[PDB]
Amino acid sequence: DFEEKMILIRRTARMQAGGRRFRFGALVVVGDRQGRVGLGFGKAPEVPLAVQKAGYYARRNMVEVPLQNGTIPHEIEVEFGASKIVLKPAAPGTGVIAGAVPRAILELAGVTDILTKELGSRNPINIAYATMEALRQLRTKADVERLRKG
Amino acid sequence: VKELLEAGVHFGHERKRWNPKFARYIYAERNGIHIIDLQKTMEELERTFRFIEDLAMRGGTILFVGTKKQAQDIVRMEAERAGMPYVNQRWLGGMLTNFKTISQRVHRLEELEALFASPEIEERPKKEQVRLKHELERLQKYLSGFRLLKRLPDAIFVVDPTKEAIAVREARKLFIPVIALADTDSDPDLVDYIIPGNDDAIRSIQLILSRAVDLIIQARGGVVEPSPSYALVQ
Amino acid sequence: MLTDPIADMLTRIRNATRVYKESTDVPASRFKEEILRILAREGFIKGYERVDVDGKPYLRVYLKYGPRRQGPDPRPEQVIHHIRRISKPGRRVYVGVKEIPRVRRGLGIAILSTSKGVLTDREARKLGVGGELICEVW
RNA sequence: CGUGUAGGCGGCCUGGGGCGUCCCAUGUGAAAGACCACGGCUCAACCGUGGGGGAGCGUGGGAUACGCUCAGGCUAGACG
RNA sequence: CCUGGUCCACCCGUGACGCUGAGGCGCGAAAGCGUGGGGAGCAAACCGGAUUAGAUACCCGGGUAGUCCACGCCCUAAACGAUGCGCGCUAGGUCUCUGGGUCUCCUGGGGGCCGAAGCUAACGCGUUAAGCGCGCCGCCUGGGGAGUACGGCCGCAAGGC
Numbered sequence A: 001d002f003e004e005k006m007i008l009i010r011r012t013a014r015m016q017a018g019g020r021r022f023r024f025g026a027l028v029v030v031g032d033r034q035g036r037v038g039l040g041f042g043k044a045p046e047v048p049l050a051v052q053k054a055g056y057y058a059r060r061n062m063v064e065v066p067l068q069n070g071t072i073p074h075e076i077e078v079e080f081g082a083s084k085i086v087l088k089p090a091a092p093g094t095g096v097i098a099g100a101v102p103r104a105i106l107e108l109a110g111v112t113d114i115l116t117k118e119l120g121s122r123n124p125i126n127i128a129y130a131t132m133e134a135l136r137q138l139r140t141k142a143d144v145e146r147l148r149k150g
Numbered sequence B: 001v002k003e004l005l006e007a008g009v010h011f012g013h014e015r016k017r018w019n020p021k022f023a024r025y026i027y028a029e030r031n032g033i034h035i036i037d038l039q040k041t042m043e044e045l046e047r048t049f050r051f052i053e054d055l056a057m058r059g060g061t062i063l064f065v066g067t068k069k070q071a072q073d074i075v076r077m078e079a080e081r082a083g084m085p086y087v088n089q090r091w092l093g094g095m096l097t098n099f100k101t102i103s104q105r106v107h108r109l110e111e112l113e114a115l116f117a118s119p120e121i122e123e124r125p126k127k128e129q130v131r132l133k134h135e136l137e138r139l140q141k142y143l144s145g146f147r148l149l150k151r152l153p154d155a156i157f158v159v160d161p162t163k164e165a166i167a168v169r170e171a172r173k174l175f176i177p178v179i180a181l182a183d184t185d186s187d188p189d190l191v192d193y194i195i196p197g198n199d200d201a202i203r204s205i206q207l208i209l210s211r212a213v214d215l216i217i218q219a220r221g222g223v224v225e226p227s228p229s230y231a232l233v234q
Numbered sequence C: 001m002l003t004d005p006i007a008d009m010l011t012r013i014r015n016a017t018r019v020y021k022e023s024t025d026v027p028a029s030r031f032k033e034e035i036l037r038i039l040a041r042e043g044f045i046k047g048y049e050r051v052d053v054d055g056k057p058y059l060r061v062y063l064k065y066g067p068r069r070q071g072p073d074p075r076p077e078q079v080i081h082h083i084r085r086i087s088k089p090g091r092r093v094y095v096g097v098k099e100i101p102r103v104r105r106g107l108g109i110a111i112l113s114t115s116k117g118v119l120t121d122r123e124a125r126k127l128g129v130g131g132e133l134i135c136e137v138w
Numbered sequence D: 001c002g003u004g005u006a007g008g009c010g011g012c013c014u015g016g017g018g019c020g021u022c023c024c025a026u027g028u029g030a031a032a033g034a035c036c037a038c039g040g041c042u043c044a045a046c047c048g049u050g051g052g053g054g055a056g057c058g059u060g061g062g063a064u065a066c067g068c069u070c071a072g073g074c075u076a077g078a079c080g
Numbered sequence E: 001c002c003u004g005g006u007c008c009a010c011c012c013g014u015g016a017c018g019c020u021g022a023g024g025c026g027c028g029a030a031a032g033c034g035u036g037g038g039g040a041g042c043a044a045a046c047c048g049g050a051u052u053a054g055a056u057a058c059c060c061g062g063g064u065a066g067u068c069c070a071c072g073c074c075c076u077a078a079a080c081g082a083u084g085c086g087c088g089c090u091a092g093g094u095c096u097c098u099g100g101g102u103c104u105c106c107u108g109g110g111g112g113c114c115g116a117a118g119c120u121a122a123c124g125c126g127u128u129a130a131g132c133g134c135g136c137c138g139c140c141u142g143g144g145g146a147g148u149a150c151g152g153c154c155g156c157a158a159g160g161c
């Protein structure tokens, strides 16, 4: 049980002798707002159902977003697919400036001070997957020199 | 007493169909065959048991798997003889990953297990008799060792991992520590606890599966003579 | 014939780690040692020693990587996740002192040759100098 | 598709110069505008004072890793 | 007979003499052009015969340039790996061509298939990279208009840049 807010929903379609069957897609983000979030994509014969599955998957796949003042440890860039995403931390008291997808995700992740920017393909779905793998790649001075032991 | 046994007729296997990853566990190539270093195989057997033993003496269940004929039965024994689940037939997909659905078919095995000895058989036209019998037959046929614990095993032991890597994926995707008996036909890396050795000659499987099932019970009491192995063994 | 032996070196390493590996051997150089000295001294490797492969001096450079991981693809994290050269042989990239970059928010290193030896983002900022920003590592 | 002119690009070691490059000092970089403070008109816009910055470029001094140049050597590229 | 490139072995010689390359220069399939030979077969064009609503076509019987040679032009292409060249670096497996060795084996160049890692929009690529890097050249910037117009340069013309 977390925040749970859905990014986008879409109706797709497939062809078959006699007309077009359909299906609906739901992208959903999930967070407690402490540094826990998860992305979930769910497709099914109907709107209600799809959204449900979304949430279920969302929880299945969550990431430890390590804040450092309600912002972020370091600046990162990540390409997933044809879609590039830039993450730059802001000084406390700024706001979370981003487009639907990146914002969405980042709110529940409990950020409050972040500069973004979608580049390349601005496909929601892939910007999603993009942002995750960015957060998923966040390091603090700790876990850093934690690897520079020896 | 260890080095003598294995090196007796239980090492050196797959040749030139190898896998360069598994090379830190090789000595050389005799007659064309890859001959695996046992000296290191020991230092790994050690740690592999260091795990089994720190699990058997903490009461956690292990799932043995081998679906290749040269190592089917020899695992049907060792398992019952340790009271542990196993999969002798075709390791159905999604067993662990989809544990809530493969289990819905074990709750159907007994649904026929308790309509087996019953007064309801008096009726039911011969149609449903051949049917529910057969259904039972096969249900049984595949789930002989897959009832026991209705709960994700805290580990998994396996013969040839690359022969049944499907399983290893399920386990790995769930986070289930993996232990297995890989040769040069397999890739180390994706196995948490490694038993480098022969994996086709029914010899080496016995010598390793036995002492493993033995070290299982050595953390419970009941030290005995090994299990039924020789019958047509060569 | 190699144009920038350094960008090479670094690439040798970038490729080395990708599959993880005891060591990799850049051909020797009194500047490549220099550069390397700051990798180890800042903890990106175990180190390096001289060697040879038939009259030819090299540098055995012993890498460093993270702790084995859980779940699918259990390959370790990387000590060096990213190493890309700044100043290139086709565009020398010089920097005054107040211009010096701040790699990854202190988490990384900006090795860079100077009028008084190969320093770094912190090291030079202190000694108060600048020079050919050699590369960024993290 | 080749061959090659100019041009761009240049392997290992040692030293000389210090042209690029880096640092410090100083001249210059008007004022107005901008930007931080403070007040002046009832606030504000406008407006005053004060401070702080400005790349560049000249002058003097210094460093010598990398680039350049002159010099001495090597054989891993290249050629025979 | 004359001549180019290219790989191997010995570690002998010079001692960085290298890489790329705007312009230039050379080469450049087929068709096409000029001058002069040559002509069996094939064959644009063209003539016939069928088919066909028609059949300037597909199928059949003929047939001229051309296809060939010498010398000179033309300089285009699905000139295709639709993949510029050079160097270093990043698992192996399989068969194949051709070198060398105290030759069931190892090593060196070349040509194929499957494929780690990694790339990729995907298809696929993968030590013959579309991987990871440096150098240098060429090129792209929505479709049609249009490789057209004008100008310029080259060409006997066709036409080319």
Ligand SMILES: [Mg+2]
Binding pocket: A081, A082
């Ligand atoms: Mg891209």
Ligand SMILES: [Mg+2]
Binding pocket: none
């Ligand atoms: Mg030149």
Ligand SMILES: [Mg+2]
Binding pocket: none
């Ligand atoms: Mg002023």
Ligand SMILES: [Mg+2]
Binding pocket: none
């Ligand atoms: Mg000499």
Ligand SMILES: [Mg+2]
Binding pocket: none
């Ligand atoms: Mg050339």
Ligand SMILES: [Mg+2]
Binding pocket: none
């Ligand atoms: Mg012709």
Ligand SMILES: [Mg+2]
Binding pocket: none
């Ligand atoms: Mg003619």
Ligand SMILES: [Mg+2]
Binding pocket: none
């Ligand atoms: Mg005809």
Ligand SMILES: [Mg+2]
Binding pocket: none
């Ligand atoms: Mg004819």
Ligand SMILES: [Mg+2]
Binding pocket: E028, E075
């Ligand atoms: Mg021609």
Ligand SMILES: [Mg+2]
Binding pocket: E080
């Ligand atoms: Mg072709």
Ligand SMILES: [Mg+2]
Binding pocket: none
């Ligand atoms: Mg080859």
Ligand SMILES: [Mg+2]
Binding pocket: none
């Ligand atoms: Mg392939």
Ligand SMILES: [Mg+2]
Binding pocket: E127
């Ligand atoms: Mg190969």
Ligand SMILES: [Mg+2]
Binding pocket: none
């Ligand atoms: Mg237009």
Ligand SMILES: [Mg+2]
Binding pocket: E146, E147
């Ligand atoms: Mg056009």
